[PDB]
């Protein structure tokens, strides 16, 4: 099979127009049909365009497809916040009976204002310490855009060992959340005088600290 190259992503403000390109390496890509799919995260893909430019029933007319040389393009007119999704182009090779997907393009709709993360830090509970376990819990929430970086400090020195951090996840209020856990032994926790979960977001770092009580 051959490969279809898509843009890593695309960004635009509400009402703006955005275009997503698609390049095939196969020799016959110019004349072969191209299809476009939209996948809202958490849902199944849906067909937007088939046969270069045709649009199924119930798909908004601000989606359109076109072909230029050995390339295909999807154009989204009048951007709306729900248009945030991944967009995949696809081609079909008749000589192999293969479907070939593009790498996908993530469309971000600009406009939402920057929000700093709220940090909540919990020490290991006494019940967990009685179970010979210890877990520090750093809960992060209410930040936009959807990216943070987390660092931990034992006293005034970095740790890295035992850090488990999740991917950003979209909250119900369209901001983002994340969690970071530090596994430790009861003696490590009572060895240091405190730990500090440092969350960095847009060049600003938010810090919380807990100590054995």
């Amino acid at each position: 099979q051959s490969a279809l190259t898509q843009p890593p992503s695309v960004s635009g403000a509400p009402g703006e127009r955005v275009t997503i390109s698609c390049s095939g390496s196969g020799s016959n890509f110019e004349y072969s049909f191209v299809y476009w799919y939209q996948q809202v995260p958490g849902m199944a893909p849906k067909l937007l365009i088939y046969d270069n430019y045709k649009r199924p029933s119930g798909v908004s007319d601000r989606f359109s497809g076109s072909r230029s040389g050995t390339s295909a393009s999807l154009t989204i007119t009048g951007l709306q916040t729900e248009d945030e999704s991944d967009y995949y182009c696809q081609s079909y090779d008749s000589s192999l009976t293969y479907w070939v997907f593009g790498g996908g393009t993530r469309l971000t709709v600009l406009g939402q204002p920057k929000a700093a993360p709220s940090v909540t830090l919990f020490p290991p509970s006494s019940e967990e310490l009685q179970a010979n376990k210890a877990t520090l819990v750093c809960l992060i929430s209410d930040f936009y855009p959807g990216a943070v970086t987390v660092a931990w400090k034992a006293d005034s020195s970095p740790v890295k060992a035992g850090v488990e951090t999740t991917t950003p996840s979209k909250q119900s209020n369209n901001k983002y959340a994340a969690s970071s856990y530090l596994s430790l032994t009861p003696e490590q926790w009572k060895s240091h005088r405190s730990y500090s979960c440092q969350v960095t977001h847009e060049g600003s770092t938010v810090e919380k600290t807990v100590a054995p009580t």
């Binding site: 199944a44 046969d51 995949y88 079909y92 909540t120 809960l139 856990y181």
Partner: protein, 218 residues
């Protein structure tokens, strides 16, 4: 309102086999084709295979040679994909998609099933240990740590549903041991801390583990 109804989520050990089904709703096989498209977590769609039940032809991507068998049952209009000798790379959501117009023409996937999540992991089923996260015009934050369970999902309630305001259950973390951990925190007026009790109700259905943990001020 035609649909493709798929089977449910399956948890598998590496080396095992999985069989996902896809049944037509509101139509019959006819001249349609049926494809299988999977999506690993955090990656793009990948085409797996295809079946044209009318003529009986089946094909699948080169990387799945010898591991997939696509079959069909015309009397119940059900398509089956069987993927054997599973590995971590096979952890994905497996979709079925109908292809072609009512004359068997066209190659666009126009009707999609909701998908079926397949998890491949050597971890064994385990219920979670629940620990309280004690609180220490201001608000207070108190929570529950749901530690070391497999597989997903777990549900977290507060006061059997009665407390729904200020509740934030965060997505879980996957530890290096294959077990999951998550946390659920509620924000309350700090003066309410001495008015009432707070109980988090943890339910882990894959292990029928139900835990009620009281969360008290230090």
């Amino acid at each position: 309102q035609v649909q493709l109804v798929q089977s449910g989520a399956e948890v598998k050990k590496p080396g095992a086999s999985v069989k996902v089904s896809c049944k037509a709703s509101g139509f019959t096989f006819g001249r349609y084709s049926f494809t299988w498209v999977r999506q690993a977590p955090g990656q793009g769609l990948e085409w797996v295979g295809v079946i044209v039940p009318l003529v009986g032809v089946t094909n699948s991507a080169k990387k799945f040679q010898g591991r997939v068998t696509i079959t069909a049952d015309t009397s119940t209009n059900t398509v089956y994909m069987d993927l054997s000798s599973l590995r971590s790379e096979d952890t994905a959501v497996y979709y079925c998609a109908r292809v072609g117009d009512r004359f068997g023409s066209g190659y666009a996937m126009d009707v999609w099933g909701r998908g079926a999540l397949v998890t491949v992991s050597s971890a064994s089923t385990k219920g979670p240990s629940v620990f309280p996260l004690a609180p220490s015009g201001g608000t207070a934050a108190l929570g529950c740590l749901v530690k070391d369970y497999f597989p997903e999902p777990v549900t977290v309630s507060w006061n059997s549903g009665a407390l729904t305001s200020g509740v934030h259950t965060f997505p879980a973390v996957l530890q290096s041991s294959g077990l999951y951990s998550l946390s659920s925190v509620v924000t309350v007026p700090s003066s309410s801390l001495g008015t009432q009790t707070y109980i988090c109700n943890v339910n882990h259905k894959p292990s029928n583990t139900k835990v009620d943990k009281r969360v008290e001020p230090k």
